[PDB]
């Protein structure tokens, strides 16, 4: 996020010194990149005690929320985002068959 600004700036300088007839090459405001809400990604009953076919419905609801970005009650989207590989954390106490 912060590291990209460097890359962008060096690349802008090349077009600037190359072409002077066209001046003031546009840039976006800093908050376009700083703001995290703009980008797509950003009372809990104990599931262990539940019946099976209700765990299935709950997990489906959380996954349907997961698909569009942010995570859900029983499954979390890990905030590491190291390198470029996103990872997710399912609740530990589930049925192994559902979990895989």
């Amino acid at each position: 996020l912060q590291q990209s600004l460097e890359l962008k700036r060096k690349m802008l300088r090349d077009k600037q010194n190359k072409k002077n007839s066209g001046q003031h090459l546009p840039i976006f405001p800093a908050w376009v990149y700083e703001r995290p809400a703009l980008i797509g990604d950003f009372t809990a009953l104990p599931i262990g005690t539940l019946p099976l076919a209700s765990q299935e419905s709950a997990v489906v609801e959380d996954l349907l929320y997961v698909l569009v970005g942010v995570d859900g009650r029983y499954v979390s989207a890990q905030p590491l985002a190291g390198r470029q590989s996103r990872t997710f954390l399912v609740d530990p106490n589930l049925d192994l068959s559902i979990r895989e």
């Binding site: 192994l96 068959s97 979990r99 895989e100």
Partner: peptide, 29 residues
């Protein structure tokens, strides 16, 4: 009742298993 598992054993599940392993030594169902 147990048959529900078997229905999903047709697909990959954990109730029954496909341990990616040597047949019948660690490979199991």
């Amino acid at each position: 009742e147990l048959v529900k598992d078997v229905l999903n054993v047709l697909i990959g599940v954990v109730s029954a298993t496909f341990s990616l392993c040597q047949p019948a030594q660690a490979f199991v169902v």
